[PDB]
Design a protein that fits this description.
CATH class of chain A: Mainly Alpha
PDB class: viral protein
Helix content of chain A: over 70%
Organism (chains D, E, F): Murine coronavirus (strain A59) (MHV-A59)
Keywords: MHV, coronavirus, heptad repeat, fusion core, viral entry, Viral protein
Largest interface: A-B, 36 and 26 residues
Oligomer: homohexamer
Distance between the termini of chain A: 12 Å
Number of helices of chain A: 2
Function (chains D, E, F): Acts as a viral fusion peptide which is unmasked following S2 cleavage occurring upon virus endocytosis.
CATH topology of chain A: Single alpha-helices involved in coiled-coils or other helix-helix interfaces
Protein name (chains D, E, F): Spike protein S2'
Number of domains of chain A: 1
Structural class of chain A: mainly alpha
Chain lengths: 74, 74, 74, 81, 81, 81
């Protein structure tokens, strides 16, 4: 009970770290895929990715998780 | 108990949103990295990524999670 | 109780599969974005992405989750 | 006069449990087949992609019916008592 | 002599419950407004990005106060008893 | 004749608790060291990558032994009683 809630609280903390990391990962990727995309764009005019939604949804889920912790003294 | 299960059910709903978002994110990325890869491929023959497994595994985990909800009236 | 812990244990197993998959996904992406980045690099000198942190954090969260399972006989 | 009633009751308890045991084995078979066919369908939707499916969970019910069967066992009336 | 006391007590129980009912409806209003304004703020921080906010949870407390109000109902003294 | 037995028992209860207290502090030390060395190893496997490790959990057991020690305290026999 207090053991069940404690093990659930630990899990939560680890689920947010993972999504946190996932979100940090999606940022670097879009920054790079897009940096290189535009680079290849610059090269092509001489012969002449948007993860907003997903990242925000993950940020919202982390928020929701944080709101799921059980207050053991309760 | 009913409080513990309720807080666990909330968490679940938020874990699926996050994986949902992760899966949507992996799709856009592969579509782009591959669109640009083939673009750079077209350019190279003038001087002349597959996330199936992972996305499906995430879709399977979401399914499993949905199957983990506790029926409070039970 | 035993039903609550069992449903929590199932969830855990599915949360690790998902992060597992996410981590496998971040690897392929970096390998590709970087393979193509360097390819476009080779092409540019003829007219002449690092997900370490995030992937490891996700691997750490999976570890933490595995440590959250409830021993039903206890 | 109390024997005859008690006797007709006991006989009845035997048949009721027999009936609830049948009901529970039937639930078992239905949950398995329905879920097995649900996976077959969700698998197909997946390959076709490479409109949702639901699975059944009758554990609570099969457990209550199992409890009831054991409760009934307690009602048997020893005729010597 | 025991009637007068009992009478003054009952009257008192009525006012205490009245007071705890008010306290609980006040907690209700505060949790809602505070949380509603917290979302307004967390939403703004989000659009400005496109320094954290916390939400209130008074369920435990509102539940204890609700239990206390019902416990008090039990203390009423029937004068005929 | 009942004093001597009771006396030899009490003495015994003191030594048993003494023994279970030692066992529990030993479990404490083992869980910590084993887990600390497990992290050292899982850390190494990580840097070498930049074949799994397990951690110990003896909370249940240390808790049962702690309960037993307190139960034994209850068995002490007051000689005057």
């Amino acid at each position: 009970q207090k053991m069940i809630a404690s093990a659930f609280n630990n899990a939560l903390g680890a689920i947010q770290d993972g999504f946190d990391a996932t979100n940090s990962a999606l940022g670097k990727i879009q920054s790079v895929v897009n940096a290189n995309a535009e680079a290849l764009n610059n090269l092509l005019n001489q012969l002449s990715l948007d993860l907003t939604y997903e990242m925000n949804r993950i940020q919202d889920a982390i928020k929701k998780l944080n709101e799921s912790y059980i207050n053991l003294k309760e």
